[PDB]
Design a protein around this ligand. Structure first.
Ligand SMILES: [Pr+3]
Lengths: 222, 213
């Protein structure tokens, strides 16, 4: 029942300070331990640090200690991470987690979904969303493939859903690719029965939080 | 500090198999260890704590063992849903430290790709750019060759591709490839084609279309 909600910028300029907050629901931060963890792209998990609310006590990874600060807000049931003097080496998905203890034993029992922070001097840019229309060339003996092309955005990530999440079966959203321009591009496809292409409406929902871009594109036969 | 050595780095196994991952600490950690599963794109989730205690709702196919410096995670009957990277964590002494991780992949039978080609939308062409997309759907193993052709001339240096992680239902991959030309260059040619080669195909599959015909 305990949920950890993370928030913070997807984009940070080099040398400046990264700030992230973990809003907790279904539990009080006045109990147990609260930690931050990060995962650089293509890399493993790295423990950053933890805080204990009642005593305001903290412990840090010695590799980040000089730049990292974990703090708490009891009135808002929130705990936060401040990381100063960031570089591209700090680009990662940042996770928050509750450390639960029971006697000798300690472990992380719930995690936040993670937030991708990108350390770059480049500007934010929202995506254009183009339909990948179904047709005879995307029909295969009963099944039709359709999709959306999400092009030229920065930074990551973009989230894609179909019919507001009511449709996940047969859906494939592909890893973003970094183009020559320095902008990302992504596609999402769903295979459906051909007979439903006139009966059923198909809509891709696209969100790019870093630029506050929200697009709902309908996809119809051509 | 305490260093966690996890092994293997990756493994491939068939459904129903029993696989074991091991973590070794530089120092005895008194069963102060837990294990996490991370599916692609998702946050980690707790599997095991206190070396062998199962988290609520965790399948009994996952079991933990060990003491002193040596610990193991075992998946007794590997399922397609278990494709993930697995991490151990020592909870014995700060700084807390994770293992490097173990990627788990499913070995399965060959499956040929379904191939679809998408012309650029009228919407995009109004912008002066043209993206042609080729979809390879639900295949195994991962290795696949996509060759773009424009009026039968083999393209090079103007496409990019992406491959999904292994599917949690059927352990297949899918691949998206985009050919990007200018609107001008696009309107100079007629026949756009992607030719696919793959172990499950007796011959190369070509999907093509005629620009506006
Ligand atoms: Pr392997």
């Amino acid at each position: 029942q305990v949920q950890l909600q993370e928030s913070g910028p997807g984009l940070v300029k080099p040398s400046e300070t990264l700030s992230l907050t973990c809003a907790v629901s279904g539990a009080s931060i006045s109990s147990n331990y609260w930690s931050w963890i990060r995962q650089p792209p293509g890399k493993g998990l790295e423990w950053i640090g933890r805080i204990y609310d009642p005593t305001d006590s903290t412990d840090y990874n010695p590799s980040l200690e000089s730049r990292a600060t974990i703090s708490k807000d009891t009135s808002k049931n929130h705990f936060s991470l401040t990381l100063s003097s960031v570089t591209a080496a700090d680009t990662a998905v940042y996770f928050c987690a509750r450390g639960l203890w029971s006697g000798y034993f300690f472990w992380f029992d719930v995690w936040g979904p993670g937030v991708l922070v990108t350390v770059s001097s480049a500007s934010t840019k929202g995506p254009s969303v183009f339909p990948l229309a179904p047709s005879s060339k995307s029909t295969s003996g009963g099944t039709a493939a359709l999709g959306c092309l999400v092009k030229d955005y920065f930074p990551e990530p973009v989230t894609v859903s179909w019919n507001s999440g009511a449709l996940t079966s047969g859906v494939h959203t592909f890893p973003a690719v970094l183009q020559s321009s320095g902008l990302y591009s992504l596609s999402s496809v769903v295979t459906v029965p051909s007979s439903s292409l006139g009966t059923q409406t198909y809509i891709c929902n696209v969100n790019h939080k870093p630029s506050n871009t929200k697009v709902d594109k309908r996809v119809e036969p051509k | 500090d305490i260093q966690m050595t996890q092994s293997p780095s990756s493994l491939s196994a068939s459904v129903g198999d029993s696989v074991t991952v091991t973590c070794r600490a530089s120092q005895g950690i008194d069963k102060e260890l837990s294990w996490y599963q991370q599916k692609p794109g998702k946050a980690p989730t707790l599997l095991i704590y206190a070396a062998s205690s199962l988290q609520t709702g965790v399948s009994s196919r996952f079991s933990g063992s060990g003491s002193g410096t040596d610990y193991t995670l075992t998946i007794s009957s590997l399922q397609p849903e278990d494709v993930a990277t697995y991490y151990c964590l020592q909870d014995y002494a700060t700084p807390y430290s994770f293992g490097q991780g173990t990627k788990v992949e499913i070995k399965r039978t060959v499956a040929a790709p379904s191939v679809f080609i998408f012309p650029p939308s009228d919407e995009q062409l109004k912008s002066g750019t043209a993206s042609v997309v080729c979809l390879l759907n639900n295949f195994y193993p991962r290795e696949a060759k996509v060759q773009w052709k424009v009026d039968n001339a083999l393209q090079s240096g103007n496409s990019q591709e992406s491959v999904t992680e292994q599917d949690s239902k059927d352990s297949t991959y899918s691949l998206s490839s985009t050919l990007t030309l200018s609107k001008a260059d696009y309107e100079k040619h007629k026949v756009y084609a992607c030719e696919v080669t793959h172990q499950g195909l007796s011959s190369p599959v070509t999907k093509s279309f005629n620009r506006g015909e």
